[PDB]
Design a protein around this ligand. Structure first.
Ligand SMILES: CC(C)C[C@H](NC(=O)[C@@H](NC(=O)[C@H](CCONC(=N)N)NC(=O)OCc1ccccc1)C1CCCCC1)[C@@H](O)CC(=O)NCCc1ccccc1
Ligand SMILES: *[C@@H]1O[C@H](CO)[C@@H](O[C@@H]2O[C@H](CO)[C@@H](O)[C@H](O)[C@H]2NC(C)=O)[C@H](O)[C@H]1NC(C)=O
Ligand SMILES: *[C@@H]1O[C@H](CO)[C@@H](O)[C@H](O)[C@H]1NC(C)=O
Length: 394
């Protein structure tokens, strides 16, 4: 099938997000945007902003675009149930990280060009930032590109507009995140990228307009750490640096990642203390004890030493020896989550990128996308996963 391919840039340790370039307006102004399957808006600062940080590109200049239209209110009223303030339809977006971006809406021409020179254009309603706070003030990306789906009487989103204006493509997009940059694919997924070929693992979405799936358990050394009787409904969110899970599952995983974190390999006491542990030593016993020792001995043998950074986040010198995690999907299929995904590159170490959820919002984030193709099958309401050799940029 026809696949249009766009370059993604970024990383987990320094940017904390991945981003792409799109052209906005006539003549085009190149604007870099965080790729976020967890939000619906497309927005960035606009010239004349007074409460905005400095980003890779200068604020979008509405006066230089022959095709921009500020969405002024008619009869002090606004389409899409938006609110009128000071003559313009107000843009206002809060994120779970705590950030609140605000300003006003405008429309202009959006232009998306693959690196094979294939181009989709359309008009989009977009937000001008007149106020930024929190991480937005200090990030390098100029704005955010929400990748979620349009609602019945809501603002048509980028993804829906993109496919409405490229009927030559199948309604599927794929995100291929590597350690540095990656690729966005419109039209399907690339089987050439699959490792070896392994089979795509499919899961049904659980809400009509957002990307959620049900995770029925999470195993380490054959042992389910998830306490949830029913499932967890998890957002599949490329705009979330880390994966976020309940505190109890977090503390169990951390209990064994600590055992596997040895800060000084020449302390024979500490190494011997660990190698002496039995199934009975643990707070929580394991069903695959033999696999735990296989991992522990591999770490000791290769001298894969560990340092703890801010908050007891373990960082190993090698991927070698760390265990696989296994995510139980609704199939009862147990999907492999390897160290080259859930660890992320920070300088010369590999650091764990798994955090406590907040607000009761579990999230599958960038450390779950990494070194995978994540396949958003819009027409069939499913999301697919397969291990992949994702492009890198730079
Ligand atoms: C780019 C980002 C702003 C997009 C949203 N992501 C988020 O809000 C998340 N943020 C993140 O992962 C951020 C992403 C990048 O930083 N943000 C900006 N550059 N602007 N990562 C991050 O905070 O990493 C930790 C950290 C980074 C840097 C310094 C110190 C600590 C999560 C949310 C859950 C708790 C942890 C933080 C988005 O994906 C989710 C969202 O808020 N969507 C809006 C609508 C909605 C409402 C309710 C539920 C679901 C969706
Ligand atoms: C580690 O200990 C647990 C708990 O004793 C073992 O799991 C139990 O195994 C018995 C059979 O001997 C079952 O009747 C229990 O229902 C099991 N409980 C749980 C929570 O699994 C486990 O097999 C031990 N692992 C090893 C490798 O010996
Ligand atoms: C997933 O969705 C398809 C399409 O409607 C349906 O036929 C199938 O039974 C669903 N499977 C699960 C496990 O929900």
């Amino acid at each position: 099938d026809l696949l249009y391919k766009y370059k993604l840039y970024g990383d987990i340790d320094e940017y904390a997000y991945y981003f792409l370039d799109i052209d906005i307006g006539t003549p085009e102004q190149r604007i870099s945007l965080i790729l976020d399957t967890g939000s619906s808006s497309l927005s960035f600062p606009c010239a004349g902003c007074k409460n905005c940080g400095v980003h890779m590109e200068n604020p979008f200049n509405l006066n230089n675009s022959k095709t921009s239209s500020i969405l002024y209110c008619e009869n002090e009223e606004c389409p899409f149930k938006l609110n009128c303030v000071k003559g313009k339809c107000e843009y206002m977006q809060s994120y779970c990280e705590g950030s609140q971006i605000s300003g006003f809406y405008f429309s202009d021409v959006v232009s998306v060009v693959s690196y094979n020179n294939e181009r989709v254009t359309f008009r989009k309603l977009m937000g001008c930032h007149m106020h930024e706070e929190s991480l937005f003030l200090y990030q390098q990306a100029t704005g955010v590109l929400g990748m979620s789906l349009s609602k019945p009487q809501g603002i048509p989103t980028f993804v829906n507009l993109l496919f409405d204006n490229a009927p030559q493509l199948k309604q599927v997009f794929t995100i291929c995140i590597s350690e540095n940059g990656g690729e966005l694919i419109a039209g399907g997924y690339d089987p050439a990228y699959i490792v070896r070929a392994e089979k795509v693992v499919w899961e049904n979405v659980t809400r009509k307009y957002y990307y959620y799936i049900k995770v029925r358990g999470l195993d380490m050394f054959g042992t389910n750490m998830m306490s949830s009787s029913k499932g967890l409904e998890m957002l599949v969110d490329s705009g979330s640096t880390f994966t976020h899970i309940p505190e109890d599952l977090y503390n169990k995983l951390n209990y064994f990642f600590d055992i596997l974190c040895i800060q000084d390999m020449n302390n024979a006491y500490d190494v011997n203390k660990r190698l002496k542990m039995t199934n009975e030593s643990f707070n929580n016993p394991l069903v695959q004890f033999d696999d735990f020792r296989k991992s522990l001995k591999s770490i000791i043998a290769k001298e894969n030493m560990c340092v703890k950074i801010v908050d007891g986040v373990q960082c190993w010198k090698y991927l070698e020896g760390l265990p696989d995690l296994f995510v139980t999907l609704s199939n009862n299929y147990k999907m492999k989550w390897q160290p080259h995904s859930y660890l992320y590159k920070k300088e010369s170490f590999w650091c764990k990128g798994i955090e406590k959820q907040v607000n009761n919002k579990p999230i599958l984030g960038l450390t779950f996308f990494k070194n995978r193709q994540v396949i958003f099958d819009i027409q069939k309401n499913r999301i697919g996963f397969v291990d992949a050799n994702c492009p890198s940029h730079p």
